Amino acid sequence: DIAGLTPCKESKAFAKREKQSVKKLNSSLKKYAPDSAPALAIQATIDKTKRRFENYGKFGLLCGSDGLPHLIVSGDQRHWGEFITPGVLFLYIAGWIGWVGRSYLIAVSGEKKPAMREIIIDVELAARIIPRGFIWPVAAYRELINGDLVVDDADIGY
Template sequence: MSLTIPTNLYKPISTTKLGSQFATKSRTATIVCQQQTSSEQSPSTLTSQLKAFSAALALSSIVLSAPVLPASADISGLTPCKDSKQFEKREKQEIKKLESSLKLYAPDSAPALAIKATVEKTKRRFDNYGKQGLLCGSDGLPHLIVSGDQRHWGEFITPGILFLYIAGWIGWVGRSYLIAIRDEKKPAMKEIIIDVPLANKLIWRGFSWPIAAYREYLNGELIDPNF
């Protein structure tokens, strides 16, 4: 027994036509979706940007208007000398030591007067340390801050610049004196026995040694070309 299926009962589906219809519909749907998204999201995006800008503006105004509180301890491990118990203890010890030695002399004697003057100087020194805002460690001694902090320039930067200026002034005056006497008949004697009038004149000129050194550097006279 055999079963035969007639071929005219089915109709093949055109894949090309079906694919083209689906492709056309998908492209149309994509275009419409993009247009709707751009038209619907643009107002919301603008609104969110305005909200973010307003929040940032409000936050910045709050931060700028907030008062700046001074730091209680700017250097770790150090405290202001005026608040340091070790600093006060060291002051009392030094004054007590001087006053104990004062008992060995008569009240109006020269050594007693000298010790009293030293006691007053010691009190002023410790008082100035506290007023100048110096920082003390656990040993009760002031510590110099050399990190370049502008609040502590008076401790190291300013004295350092002053030291360099004075040292350069002394060296420049000595150099000028040696140059001035090198054409003398006996320059070695002028080094042993100083020509005081010449030295005084050069000392006053030496106050402007940075300008004079820069001028000689530009003219090529600062360094001897023979060396």
């Protein structure tokens, strides 16, 4: 009820949208054989969007004055299944990728012409470096602790 937004477990315009959608779908459905595979897939999508409407009416989704879901990202973990948990999950994924790439590059830097391994990856070294993602929070942590993450006055060349 944040600023009056009722959940569409209880609102009406949501029910109207659902009704009109399933109605146009059903009216389209009655132009084939009741057993034709296209008609079967049509009914499948009908029940699929129906159970979608049902699922939305199960997870506290505060719902607009026009019959539409509306996220609540204000910080209150009451509505957190939209931003907070998916946000930290994606942050974990992004940190994974960033750390693994950085570690690969730092490793392969020590060769004759690292460009030849930057265009054509050392897929063996790549495979034995890649799964380290589970360390990206902690490892980098220690780096910053030991100051081995940044540099002070080395800018060009290396």
